[PDB]
Design a protein around this ligand. Sequence first.
Ligand SMILES: [Zn+2]
Lengths: 65, 65
Amino acid sequence: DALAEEWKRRYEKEKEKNARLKGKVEDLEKERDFYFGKLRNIELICQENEGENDPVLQRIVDILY
Amino acid sequence: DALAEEWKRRYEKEKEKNARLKGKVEDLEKERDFYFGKLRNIELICQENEGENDPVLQRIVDILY
Ligand SMILES: [Zn+2]
């Protein structure tokens, strides 16, 4: 009766929260992978130019690691 | 009665899910900010060396943007 309706409202409220959290997880994952992909692209650029011995690139490697 | 107990179990289950999603959101946010901070650190390194005209740095700027 009223005790069931009360809990249902709590379930649905918690269920709406779940839906919003699932959407934030998906958005944060895309963002993390996006920035992560850039770091791997830049790491590669640096690895190709290990022969330049550029002290700037070395700074950038330190930040990557 | 039994109808309330059933919904309670659904609320608690959904509530456990919420707790796990909140922890994943916090973990993904830390990771995203971590990688993001590195890109801003590297962007700065590049901006300091705009006078070198290094074509490698230009590659790295393109990846940053
Ligand atoms: Zn040079």
